[PDB]
Scaffold this active site. Structure first.
Site, mmCIF file in Angstrom:
data_model
loop_
_atom_site.group_PDB
_atom_site.id
_atom_site.type_symbol
_atom_site.label_atom_id
_atom_site.label_comp_id
_atom_site.label_asym_id
_atom_site.label_seq_id
_atom_site.Cartn_x
_atom_site.Cartn_y
_atom_site.Cartn_z
ATOM 1 N N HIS J 200 0.780 -1.421 0.066
ATOM 2 C CA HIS J 200 0.028 -0.059 0.056
ATOM 3 C C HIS J 200 0.992 1.256 0.006
ATOM 4 O O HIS J 200 0.249 2.356 -0.047
ATOM 5 C CB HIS J 200 -1.124 -0.157 1.354
ATOM 6 N N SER J 204 -1.561 -1.549 -6.430
ATOM 7 C CA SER J 204 -1.138 -2.775 -7.105
ATOM 8 C C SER J 204 -0.748 -2.440 -8.487
ATOM 9 O O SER J 204 -0.988 -1.279 -9.105
ATOM 10 C CB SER J 204 -2.729 -3.366 -7.263
ATOM 11 N N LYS J 226 -15.910 -9.694 -5.944
ATOM 12 C CA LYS J 226 -15.036 -10.723 -6.987
ATOM 13 C C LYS J 226 -14.126 -11.590 -6.065
ATOM 14 O O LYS J 226 -13.914 -12.778 -6.513
ATOM 15 C CB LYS J 226 -14.114 -10.057 -7.938
ATOM 16 N N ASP J 227 -13.872 -11.107 -5.033
ATOM 17 C CA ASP J 227 -13.016 -11.783 -4.125
ATOM 18 C C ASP J 227 -14.010 -13.084 -3.553
ATOM 19 O O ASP J 227 -13.410 -14.002 -3.375
ATOM 20 C CB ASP J 227 -12.534 -11.014 -2.934
ATOM 21 N N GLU J 270 6.420 -34.511 -0.736
ATOM 22 C CA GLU J 270 4.957 -34.442 -1.271
ATOM 23 C C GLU J 270 5.092 -33.236 -2.570
ATOM 24 O O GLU J 270 6.179 -32.889 -2.684
ATOM 25 C CB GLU J 270 4.134 -33.608 -0.166
#
Ligand code: JHB
Ligand code: FES
Lengths: 46, 239, 74, 99, 65, 196, 59, 439, 415, 378
Positions: J200, J204, J226-227, J270
């Protein structure tokens, strides 16, 4: 009660005049008056 | 050291929403009880586990009373033997692994609780092992006690073919062919390792459905909100 | 940084519609399918070639291992 | 001369032209480009600002412009070159003086 | 009491790739079991045959159960 | 002039109900809101079902597991305890004393003084059947396993501090505050009792 | 008569209060219906395979 | 008392000519008067090909007649002390003259000569063309004029109400003297027109003067389609201008609807403010007091604009580039608070404001003349003061809530923003601001 | 009930004039000789802060109760300053007159001018002034008066910049206590009975009491690079109350005192046509006439292009010179008189403009002159009296004030 | 004057979660940030519920895990949620990083570097998580992998024994792994919040790699709605595995208890470590292979310094796009080769695949950036 003909701001660019039809009327002909209020916006007359 | 991997048999619990055949479980148990439970332990299955699956409470209480088990100490300080109840587990053939080895010549018979889950191929694999016991090919021979199974890794196993035609009498009177005995015991060993099988798939249906509803509903809310931006038009009006 | 402090922009108009006035799926298949094909055609022979190679080095390597564990006629 | 063939091809491969952008619109803003942008005249700056606002809106919808509307390779002015060239020339003078 | 298994293991044994693999098995049967002293055996050939055979058996063995 | 701007056509994006540029959108307003808000309301009712399952499961986890509920209750056969004799049992890691009581012991614990007792109880509300008394085998003062068919008041007696319990289990002469604990039970068949 | 969606809005969805009381009452009815319905669909797919179906044989 | 005072106010007189022209008159012993012609004509009755014509005609109207060519009409009004004026809205065009009471006959004559016998000279068109074109440039500098034009445009998008009164620059530049005369003969008809007068004048006299000059007025027919309101945003981003103008509105009921009285009472509670108001913190309006103490906005006013079968009910504000969000928040708040929980005392205040508002507006013969002129066109009668009071007295706290809830609560508004408007709330955030999660 | 004005002058000097017209709304106005002219060089811009200071706490009512009390009954409270008077005005419905009257009295007779409240109010001097000065007519006319006079009338209506923050609570108290007195006050009314006004004026307005304007002639020049140039040129005219003053008012309307037809050309305006002959680009010109108690200014005002300022001012000055030489017909003076006569009657048409003219006359003169007597006094002006007024203006010592790009704007001694 | 921007707590949530200016155009590859969040909460919840029932003593350990799945109410769904939750985490992570590398989001150095640390911390956590069941692969993995540290000259041998708390992986190892495994998720929790704190400072990046200050939208309601859709799809993916294939991504051998004599056939970590396990086995020398296995992850810290192109994103960079999609296909190949026995041809494929991974990052993809630049006259 009733608001004034014009709302008054501070730091706002003034309105422009480009023709002799819109310029006429502005020339002052009688001494200045000054009014302030509670309701109605502050003004200054001829 | 080649390998022959098992073929996928069409099990009644093959499909996504396919439950276990519980009558087939009730048979498979008996195939552990009559055949396996004098060599293999199954330490994570109790007599109370059978109730509401392949036996009633009153049936399971009888199956449990039918076997010995140690308990105590009593006020004297002595460890006695008593008939079983529901709270008791399925009893181990030998008192330890070191005893077990002696009884089978060196080789330890694995615990069967999780054997479906603990082997590649699961019930497909185990079925192929039990039925697939055949006579060795030319050029071959293992130590007196190690038999030939083409499905076992390294082609040689230390277990005597454990099933054959009419190796026991089933409580519902099914013709007890070798293949039928292998089919039923594999079905039980599946439930043994994965009891949640039928609850899991009931949930699976209800998840697929609820998602089928919520995904397009939430997707519509998303497009509704964004609609303001997707539709907008820009204009560039320099002086 | 706050809204009102991000950057300077001049003489750019934006018109837009309330979501309650408009459709959520305007021409969703009509215009959607062709836009998808266009987007797929654009990237295909950047994305797809490496995953083809993987598939070929995988199947080649798998049944080379099998053959190599068979017995040789000599 | 002889690599101009590949240059023209790459330009349309790269395909920023499909969003109505010029090359200098796509330059990564380091401290030097920031300054070069800050020194632009009104017209050049507000054009850059629309062009980008037009691209980002297109990117948002996963769409391109009509082919008639795509930036022509030949019509791609290098508008930022003279401002950025100087800004860098200036810095390398202050770096030189500091030693 | 005939075992559906040992019935179907016959049915599937008389298919093209089965009988072809049953012949490949018999070749090395009377190659090693005719010759003297080489340590080569025939596990490979048997497994080939069983693979083809038991694939079929799986497809329809469960009908009769 | 700013009068040269005209809003673009949005027809392609409009809802059917607002395409007609000569009719009021206010009729359709009620409906259009109804549809979009029904989607939200449905969605919530769905997620409300989902979260009620997830939460209600996680809560269930903390509640007793099957293997602990297995030991919750212990069955006892009433034909395997003769008239007079106590018979001890392990229950939740504790002794549990079940006692057949004689027509003598019932009458002799019926007409006792209620007030003289440290913990005033009558007998007919310490058991559900007259001829059977089920008790935990733990001394209430500082924890000992009382010995049956002994003591001054002929029932249970503790060689730890100096407690004396009658045939009904009530403390008579000793330091124990409360009487022996009466577990929760009921009689199933005539022959069998379940405690837990 | 105004449309179904319209009657839905005016009567249930307008006051955020009635909107919430709706969703909760709706959820009670949806749970019961959805469960009953989906349980039928599972037990038909697995006819005669479940303890629920073969219970009668030992009672 | 006040109640009695209403009962003894001069009545408005009503009479109608053969052709259909309405004559309307309020009389009081006055040395001066005002008389004029109000016309159901403007931008809403204009098509896209002829938009701005009405406005073009207003320019030519006082530039000579058949009977008085060139500056004859001008001279005659200047010399007898009169004052000649005109205006055009989207729905109403009006020409009116303030004169000495004795000069009323010549007054009514000159009005008639302007309307009917308008020269529309060829040279005088080409002159007034470049005049309108420079006014369009002046109007461009007025953020207020621009943002309100933008409100109409998006609010009534794809109709005739989205059209400006001045018309586009293209149309002013091409409109020929054929189009202007065609416009006039179609729209300027006796049944669309009202002659209104107020001052020292006998109603009987006006009606006869009307006969003498307005008899030639004519009586396929121009019917207004309803206009489709759209929940939209128009955002003209200009980080060049120092302050931001924002205009937001929901669809209002229109001229006829009685709800308008209650809506006025609510617009009166929220009211209006600017930086020259004596009250500040102590002001009665919570929007006004909060704006003042925190210096959110330079100014604001609530409106309720009225057309025929629709209207624009909301508010305009002017403010710092970092205040738009916060202004929008507190204003939307006030709307919601009235919708849900308006108090009797604060509605009694709003009632008193409105009683005081329209009783003082009707002061002088000009505002009373215009009330008669336009009331006849919009309502089909003058509504007496006594009646306005009976409709205001009816309004209580229950009414203000229910009426406000209809038009404001959970309804998609029109947004117009101009200037440094980066902060200006996103339409979804604005739309979400139109309901509460409690009521 | 046909009703005409009543009038009373109390022995303590105060004037009460009230017409009971039975209207729904009631205007009341307390007119005071407390204009900007009564400030000395020490207390400049006090009258400007005093005009803003209505609604500060009083003895009878709090700052809060004044605003809430008034707004409650849908009312209004306005203060108006000229160079010579101050006018405190209240509007309401006729049922709430005595509620507004209580507030009027408190505001005007007993303000507390609290230290903290008066300091808080200081910045409002700057905001008010800023807004007012957006009009270029405010610059020029403020400057004109300052150029024309040595003392009283040379005072601005707006506080000077060096005084903003520094107009003390004492300077406010002193200005009220010295100027707001029965001998200097006239209480006017519409829609209320005269007897009850008289009783209030006796009991609540009975407050004990407490140099002439020297004309100078100068020029002030605000260079500011606008494309237009505002400019005014006047000479010393006559004082209001004198018969001569009526001559200047007719001469004004001969030369042209502002417009009559929207978007017109002004075909009967002497000046506008005189200027329009020689230059056609954008412009506006009118006669300027201000008339006070001690003195007065008469001239014209030009708005012109920067480069054409020289041409327009001279053109307009030439037009007054031919009126002074004797080029003036009866049809001109008749048309002029008609404009002026119609102007007066129209300016007392509204109840607001009536109240102003009753109060205005009450302060500058002894009592009220009816509208018939005023028209008669405009008629009394002879063509010769107009030509004299003009002659006085041409030969009189001149005052000038300009704002704009003054590169082509002449000085007084270039004209 | 709202109480979203005023209240000291709300202010932080309002500025980071509601009014955050967000690019108009961010794609679905930006949804992996908030999905990683959801994974972290999910593991911690399921995890804490398992810890109410599990025990870290070598005798009862395996038994407690099977007790949860058999006797604890819905213990099974919780347990397989937590195991397939660890898979869904690592899918998210490698998708979240891929986004970084392609769109050049790493230029945000601090935000990036904190990332690398978060990746190393989640890895340490999962490694120690897969031991707690104390099955075969659990124990035999933990021994081979830990015992790589022995290769370090001078100290290596001591180091291994100090971690273990003994001469083998035994009672003292499993109890301390249960402690480290519990705490670390809470330390990831804190570091994740420094990750965002730094983000921040610039907000973005967006798919064009061009600045997006001229077209920001408020996070709510756009990227909140949308999240939710993303979170919904993450649940589907998780519950498809848990309710239809809960053992698909594991290994059978971890259903037979740990036996320090009997060795499983082909021992491997794994699926989300296999790529690095393959690179390890590439180098024949054992210390070399530990420096390669270490550098295969730490090379993430070197990616910003290898950026040559004058464009930030690979959107308008075709050469880079291909080489990038080659690096992805090569990593898919290292995963396959990781889960194979050491023999022909898997030794040579693994070597070539390892050489190509390091070759792509240090030489080819930097060169491609430059060639692109000179093709644009830059
Ligand atoms: C916080 C944050 C998110 C975001 C991150 C996570 C979620 C879901 C979530 C939220 C919180 C959480 O716990 C935590 F706080 F992390 F510890 C775990 C999961 C929802 C949104 N998404 C963004 C997207 C863009 Cl483009 C910019 C800034 C942001 C931005 O600051
Ligand atoms: S413990 Fe036996 S009574 Fe104290």
């Amino acid at each position: 009660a009733v608001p004034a003909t014009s709302e008054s701001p501070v730091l706002d660019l003034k309105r422009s005049v480009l023709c002799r039809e819109s310029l006429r009327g502005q020339a002052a002909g009688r001494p200045l008056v000054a009014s302030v209020s509670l309701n109605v916006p502050a003004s200054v007359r001829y | 050291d080649l390998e022959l991997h098992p073929p996928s048999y069409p099990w009644s619990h093959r499909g996504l929403l396919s439950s276990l055949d519980h009558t087939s479980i009730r048979r498979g148990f008996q195939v552990y009880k009559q055949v396996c439970s004098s060599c293999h332990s199954m330490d994570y299955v109790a007599y109370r586990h059978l109730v509401g699956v392949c036996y009633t409470e009153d049936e399971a209480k009888a199956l449990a009373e039918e076997v010995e088990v140690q308990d105590g100490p009593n006020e004297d300080g002595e460890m006695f033997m008593r008939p079983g109840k529901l709270s008791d587990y399925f009893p181990k053939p030998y008192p330890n692994p070191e005893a077990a080895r002696a009884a089978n010549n060196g080789a330890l018979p694995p615990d069967l609780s999780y054997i479906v889950r603990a082997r590649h191929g699961g019930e497909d694999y185990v079925f192929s092992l039990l039925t697939g016991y055949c006579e060795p090919p030319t050029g071959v021979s293992l130590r007196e006690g190690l038999y030939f199974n083409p499905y076992f890794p390294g082609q040689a196993i230390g277990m005597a073919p454990p099933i054959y035609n009419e190796v026991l009498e089933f409580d519902d009177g099914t013709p007890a062919t070798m293949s039928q005995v292998a089919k039923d015991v594999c079905t039980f060993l599946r439930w043994a390792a994965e009891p949640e099988h039928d609850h899991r798939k009931r949930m699976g249906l209800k998840m697929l459905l609820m998602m089928g509803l919520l995904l397009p509903l939430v997707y519509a809310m998303k497009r509704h909100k964004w609609s303001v931006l997707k539709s907008r038009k820009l204009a560039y009006r320099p002086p | 940084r706050q809204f009102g402090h991000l950057t300077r922009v001049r003489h750019v108009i934006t018109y837009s519609l309330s979501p309650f006035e408009q459709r959520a799926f305007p021409h969703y298949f009509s215009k959607g399918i062709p836009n998808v094909l266009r987007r797929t055609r654009a990237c295909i022979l950047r994305v797809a070639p490496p995953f083809v190679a993987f598939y070929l080095v995988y199947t080649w390597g798998t049944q080379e291992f099998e053959k190599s564990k068979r017995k040789n006629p000599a | 001369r002889w690599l101009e063939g590949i240059r023209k091809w790459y330009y349309n491969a790269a395909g920023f032209n499909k969003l109505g952008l010029m090359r200098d619109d796509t330059i990564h803003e380091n401290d030097d480009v920031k300054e070069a942008i800050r020194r632009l005249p009104e017209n050049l700056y507000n054009d850059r600002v629309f062009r980008i606002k037009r691209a980002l809106d297109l990117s948002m919808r996963q769409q391109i412009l009509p082919k008639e509307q795509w930036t022509k390779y030949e019509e791609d002015k290098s508008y930022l070159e003279p401002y950025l060239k100087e800004v860098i020339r200036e810095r390398k003078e202050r770096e030189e003086w500091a030693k | 009491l005939v075992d559906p298994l040992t019935t179907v293991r016959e049915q599937c044994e008389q298919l093209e790739k089965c009988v072809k693999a049953r012949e490949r098995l018999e070749l090395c049967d009377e190659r090693v079991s005719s010759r003297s002293q080489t340590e080569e055996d025939c596990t490979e050939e048997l497994l080939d045959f069983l693979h083809a055979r038991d694939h079929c058996v799986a497809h329809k063995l469960f009908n009769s159960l | 002039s700013h009068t040269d701007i005209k809003v673009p056509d949005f027809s392609d994006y409009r809802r059917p109900e607002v395409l007609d540029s000569t009719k009021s959108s206010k009729e359709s307003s009620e409906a259009r809101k109804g549809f979009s808000y029904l989607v939200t309301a449905t969605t919530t009712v769905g997620v409300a079902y989902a979260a009620k399952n997830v939460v209600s499961q996680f809560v269930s986890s903390m509640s007793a597991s099957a293997d602990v509920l297995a030991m919750s209750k212990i069955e006892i056969k009433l034909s395997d305890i003769p008239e007079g004799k106590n018979m001890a049992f392990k229950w939740r890691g504790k002794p549990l004393f079940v006692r057949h009581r004689t027509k003598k012991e019932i009458d002799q614990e019926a007409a006792v003084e209620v007030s003289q007792l440290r913990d005033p109880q009558h007998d007919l509300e310490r058991v559900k059947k007259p001829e059977w008394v089920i008790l935990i085998g733990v001394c209430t003062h500082l924890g000992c396993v009382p010995i049956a068919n002994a003591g001054d008041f002929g029932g249970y007696y503790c060689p730890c501090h100096g407690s004396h319990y009658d045939a009904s289990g009530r403390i008579r002469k000793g330091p124990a505050p409360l009487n022996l604990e009466v577990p929760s039970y009921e009689f199933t068949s005539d022959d069998m009792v379940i405690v837990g | 008569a105004p449309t179904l969606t319209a009657r839905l809005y005016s009567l249930l969805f307008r006051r955020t209060s009635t909107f919430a009381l709706t969703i909760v009452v709706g959820a009670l009815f949806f749970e019961r219906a959805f469960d009953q319905g989906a349980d039928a669909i599972y037990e038909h797919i697995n006819e005669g395979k479940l303890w629920k179906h073969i219970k009668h044989k030992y009672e | 008392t006040y109640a009695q005072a209403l009962q003894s106010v001069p009545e408005t007189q009503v009479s109608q000519l053969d052709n259909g022209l309405r004559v309307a008159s309020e009389q009081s012993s006055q040395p001066t008067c005002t008389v004029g012609v109000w016309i159901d004509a403007g931008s809403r009755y204009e098509s896209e090909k002829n938009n701005g014509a009405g406005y073009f005609v207003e320019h030519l109207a006082f530039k000579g007649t058949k009977n008085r060519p060139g500056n004859a009409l001008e001279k005659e009004v200047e010399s007898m002390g009169a004052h000649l004026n005109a205006y055009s809205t989207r729905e109403h065009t009006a020409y009116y003259i303030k004169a000495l009471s004795k000069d009323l006959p010549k007054a009514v004559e000159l009005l008639a000569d302007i309307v009917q016998n308008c020269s529309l000279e060829d040279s005088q068109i080409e002159k007034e063309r470049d005049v309108i074109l420079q006014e369009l440039q002046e109007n461009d500098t007025s953020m207020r004029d621009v943002v309100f034009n933008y409100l109409h445009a998006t609010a009534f998008q794809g109709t005739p109400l989205a059209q400006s009164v001045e018309g586009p620059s293209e149309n002013v530049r091409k409109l020929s003297r054929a189009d202007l005369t065609e416009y006039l003969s179609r729209h300027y008809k006796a049944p669309r027109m009202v002659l209104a007068a107020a001052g020292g004048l006998e109603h009987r006299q006006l009606l006869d003067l009307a006969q003498k000059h307005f008899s030639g007025l004519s009586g396929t027919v121009p019917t207004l389609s309803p206009c489709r309101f759209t929940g939209s945003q128009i955002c003209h981003r200009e980080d060049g201008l120092p302050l931001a103008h924002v205009a937001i509105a929901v669809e209002g009921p229109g001229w006829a609807h009685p709800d308008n009285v209650a809506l006025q009472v609510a617009n009166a509670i929220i009211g209006h403010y600017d930086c020259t108001y004596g009250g500040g913190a102590h002001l009665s309006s919570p929007l006004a007091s909060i704006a003042a103490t925190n210096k959110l906005c330079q100014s604001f006013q609530t409106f309720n604009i009225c057309y025929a079968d629709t209207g624009l009910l909301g508010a305009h504000f002017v403010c710092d580039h970092m205040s738009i969000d916060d202004m929008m928040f507190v204003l939307q708040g006030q709307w919601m608070r009235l919708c849900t929980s308006a108090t009797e005392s604060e509605v009694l205040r709003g009632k008193n404001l409105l009683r005081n508002a329209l009783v003082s507006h009707l002061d002088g013969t000009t505002p009373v003349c215009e009330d008669i002129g336009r009331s006849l066109l919009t309502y089909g009668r003058r509504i007496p003061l006594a009646e306005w009071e009976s409709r205001i007295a009816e309004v209580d706290a229950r009414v203000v809530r229910e009426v406000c809830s209809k038009y404001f609560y959970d309804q998609c508004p029109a947004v117009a923003g101009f200037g440094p408007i980066e902060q200006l709330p996103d339409y979804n955030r604005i739309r979400s601001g139109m309901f509460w999660l409690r009521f | 009930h046909p009703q005409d004005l009543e009038f009373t002058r109390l022995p303590n000097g105060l004037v009460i004039a009230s017409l009971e017209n039975y209207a729904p709304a009631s205007r009341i106005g307390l007119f005071i000789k407390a204009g900007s002219r009564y400030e000395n060089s020490n207390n400049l811009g006090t009258s400007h802060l005093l005009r803003l200071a209505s609604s500060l706490t009083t003895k009878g009512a709090s700052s809060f109760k004044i605003t809430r009390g008034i707004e409650a009954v849908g009312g209004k409270l306005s203060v108006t300053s000229t160079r010579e008077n101050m006018a405190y005005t209240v509007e309401c419905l006729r049922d709430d007159v005595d509620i507004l009257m209580e507030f009027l009295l408190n505001v005007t007779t007993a303000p507390e001018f609290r230290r903290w409240e008066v300091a808080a109010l200081q910045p409002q001097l700057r905001i008010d002034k800023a807004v007012a000065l957006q009009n270029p007519q405010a610059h020029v006319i403020e400057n004109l008066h300052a150029a024309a006079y040595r003392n009283a009338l040379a005072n601005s209506l707006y506080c000077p910049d060096y005084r903003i923050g520094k107009v003390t609570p004492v300077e406010l108290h002193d200005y009220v206590q010295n100027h707001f007195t029965s001998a200097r006050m006239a209480l006017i009314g519409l829609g209320v009975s005269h007897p009850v006004l008289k009783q209030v004026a006796e009991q609540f307005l009975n407050i004990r009491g407490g140099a002439k304007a020297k004309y100078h002639g100068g020029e002030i020049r605000e260079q500011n690079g606008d494309s237009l140039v505002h400019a005014a040129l006047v000479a010393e005219s006559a004082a209001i109350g004198s018969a001569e003053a009526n001559a200047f008012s007719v001469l004004q309307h001969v030369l042209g005192a502002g417009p009559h037809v929207k978007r017109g050309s002004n075909a009967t305006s002497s000046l506008y046509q005189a200027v329009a002959k020689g230059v056609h680009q954008p412009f506006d010109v009118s006669a300027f006439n201000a008339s006070y108690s001690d003195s007065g200014l008469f001239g014209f005002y030009t708005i012109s292009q920067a480069a054409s300022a020289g041409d327009v001012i001279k053109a307009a000055y030439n037009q007054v010179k031919t009126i002074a030489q004797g080029n003036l017909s009866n049809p001109d003076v008749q048309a002029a008189k008609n404009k002026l006569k119609a102007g007066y009657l129209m300016s007392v048409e509204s109840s607001e403009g009536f109240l102003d003219e009753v109060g205005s006359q009450a302060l500058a003169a002894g009592s009220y002159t009816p509208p018939s007597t005023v028209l008669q006094q405009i008629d009394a002006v002879a063509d010769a009296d107009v030509i004299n007024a003009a002659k006085k203006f041409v030969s009189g010592r001149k005052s000038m004030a300009a704002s704009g790009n003054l590169g082509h704007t002449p000085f007084i001694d270039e004209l | 004057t709202n109480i979203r921007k005023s209240h000291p707590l709300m202010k932080i949530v309002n500025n980071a979660f509601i009014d955050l200016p967000a690019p108009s155009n961010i794609s679905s590859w930006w949804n992996f940030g908030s999905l990683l969040g959801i994974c972290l909460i999910l593991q911690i919840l399921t995890g804490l519920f398992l810890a109410m029932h599990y025990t870290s003593d070598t005798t009862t350990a395996f038994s407690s895990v099977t007790h949860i799945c058999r006797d604890v109410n819905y213990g099974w769904i919780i347990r397989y949620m937590h195991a397939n939750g660890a898979s869904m985490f690592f899918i998210c992570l490698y998708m979240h990083v891929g986004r970084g590398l392609y769109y050049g989001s790493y230029t945000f150095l601090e935000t990036w570097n904190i990332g690398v640390i978060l990746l190393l911390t989640v890895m340490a956590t999962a490694f120690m998580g897969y031991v707690l069941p104390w099955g075969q692969m659990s124990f035999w993995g933990a021994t081979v992998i830990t015992n790589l540290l022995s290769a370090i000259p001078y100290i290596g041998t001591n180091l291994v024994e100090w971690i273990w708390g003994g001469f083998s992986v035994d009672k003292a190892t499993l109890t301390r792994f249960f402690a480290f495994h519990f705490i670390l998720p809470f330390i990831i929790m804190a570091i994740a919040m420094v990750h965002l704190l730094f983000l921040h400072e610039t907000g973005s990046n967006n798919p064009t790699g061009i600045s997006s200050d001229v077209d920001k939208i408020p996070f709510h309601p756009y990227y909140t709605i949308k999240d939710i859709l993303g979170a919904l799809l993450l649940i589907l993916a998780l519950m498809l595995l848990v309710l239809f294939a809960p053992d698909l991504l594991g290994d059978p051998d971890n259903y037979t208890p740990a036996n320090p004599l009997n060795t499983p056939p082909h021992i491997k970590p794994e699926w989300y470590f296999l790529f690095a396990y393959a690179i390890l086995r590439s180098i024949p020398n054992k210390l070399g292979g530990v420096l390669a296995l270490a550098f295969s992850i730490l090379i993430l810290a070197l990616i910003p310094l290898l950026h040559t192109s004058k464009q930030r994103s690979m959107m308008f960079r075709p050469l880079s796009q291909c080489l990038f999609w080659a690096l992805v296909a090569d990593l898919l190949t290292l995963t396959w080769i990781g889960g194979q026995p050491v023999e022909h041809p898997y030794i040579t494929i693994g070597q070539l695949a390892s050489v190509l991974y390091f070759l792509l990052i240090l030489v080819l993809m930097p060169t491609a950036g430059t060639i692109e630049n000179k093709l644009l006259k830059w």
